[PDB]
Design a binder for this molecule. Sequence first.
Ligand SMILES: NC(=[NH2+])NCCC[C@H](N)C(=O)O
Ligand SMILES: NC(=[NH2+])NCCC[C@H](N)C(=O)O
Lengths: 283, 301
Amino acid sequence: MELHILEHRVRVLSVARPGLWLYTHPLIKLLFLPRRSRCKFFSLTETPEDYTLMVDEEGFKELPPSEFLQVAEATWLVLNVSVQAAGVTKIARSVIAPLAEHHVSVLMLSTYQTDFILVREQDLSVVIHTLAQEFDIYREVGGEPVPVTRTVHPIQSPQNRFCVLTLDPETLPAIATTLIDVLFYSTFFAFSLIEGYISIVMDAETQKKFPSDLLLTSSSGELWRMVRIGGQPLGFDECGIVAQIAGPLAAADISAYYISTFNFDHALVPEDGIGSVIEVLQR
Amino acid sequence: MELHILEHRVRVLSVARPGLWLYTHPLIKLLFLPRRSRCKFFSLTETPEDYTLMVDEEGFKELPPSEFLQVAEATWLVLNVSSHQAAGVTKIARSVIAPLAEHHVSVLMLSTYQTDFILVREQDLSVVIHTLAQEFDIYREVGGEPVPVTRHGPSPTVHPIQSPQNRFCVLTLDPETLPAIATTLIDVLFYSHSTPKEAASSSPEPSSITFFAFSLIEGYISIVMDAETQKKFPSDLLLTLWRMVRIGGQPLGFDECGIVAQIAGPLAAADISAYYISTFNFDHALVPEDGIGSVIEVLQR
Ligand SMILES: NC(=[NH2+])NCCC[C@H](N)C(=O)O
Ligand SMILES: NC(=[NH2+])NCCC[C@H](N)C(=O)O
């Protein structure tokens, strides 16, 4: 029905782990102090390779250049589609496969609340032409929608069990010192704060570290297994990577959250279905 | 009547305000993550010019060198007199401050909500003991328990003073409350606009000065903050005004003696309470707000 080009203009960055200390001051601001910046799109993911940041242009300005900070080419726009499978599965045929077929490279950010599909600004007219025959397409300007006018990659699954959680923004101060400890002083951990909504992906072991009654989910105890996608770093030009994972999962009707980082892709699937997901993906 | 030499070996440092972002990672650790360091003595004072740190040797290892980090030469020991007239350093002006200055022992002061600490350089300890053993029964803290003790600067001058008009409160907190106020404390300390540099010569009575003192010493929390800044926190968490006299024109260094004495002496004769906090560059006496006029008059004599 409806595809929205959100008001965000996003840069994609990698912070090398030995340099994270240098970015503590701006990241604490972007995580916890909304009155100190105009950033409305913030996503931070920790991997064994780096910290990946996706931030809008205003949040980007808070990050000083250094030898520890890599910035992917291009400014990325954020797409969002308006009972269904969780995560990317419900947009695999309608968004992911058509963009791959038309050679538009994407970055995925599934969150607790919704699925963001990032595309480079240069591809906007192809995105519109490709998706207009299923969606009425709108651009968000001033908070309101305006109608638009004129290779097989290796996979692996570590044993970690993951939680997909949200948080009432009014309680973010109450978890701040634990979140700080986990991110800066302590492997996959994702935190995003986008248009005021918080989404967190966290190891079941890491969840034990937080105060008991603050992290929220509509499915208590629902755990996910991660499928890491890619052997060498994936870059930002190769298309069809999400599609070769999300396509088979949609055909099997298996829910999957999907998160791109700077170097790799990650699908989160129901923990009890990890065997059937691996089988499906090896076909 | 008792004087206690505490179990802290302290380094005194300054992070120049423009370099603060480089030190946010260690400072956040020392403020909020006790399981991450063996530090038992941590004092952070924000001024318009810098963040002064007094930190024990374990906390000191968290702070790597840079152009924005100044470290005072000496390793400092910490003295305390429990005595329960005017309060604060005024109570020890004649018994501790003046004798140490007369015997050329340079001090640093750190008043907290809980008590008044006097820091001295470790190489002066023998002179300190010999000077104060007549009036005080001296004990040294070993493993948390008191054990009886039985065994280059400019010449002193009268320093200029400055009397900012804002009002300060002295507060403590339940340590279990520290996590709940962390984001506000972080915002106040590290993300807030500050007053521009103002010398005493051109600004004898500034309307306001940026000044926030936080200490965590053996688990006890002490905070000195502008009264206006209390409103940013919740009222049931802050456990409970004062005017500041800032002392110095040029940075005071660590070797001139008799600076505290020239303030605490007259205040004792006027029976005026005074909290006293040394930072890397200047000294700060906090006096009851309704007495500031008398205080300025006595100091200007
Ligand atoms: N850095 C990355 N995670 N790259 C892979 C992202 C997905 C890929 N660009 C696609 O269109 O299918
Ligand atoms: N950096 C400073 N605040 N120096 C002044 C401290 C007091 C001075 N050493 C005295 O013995 O009286």
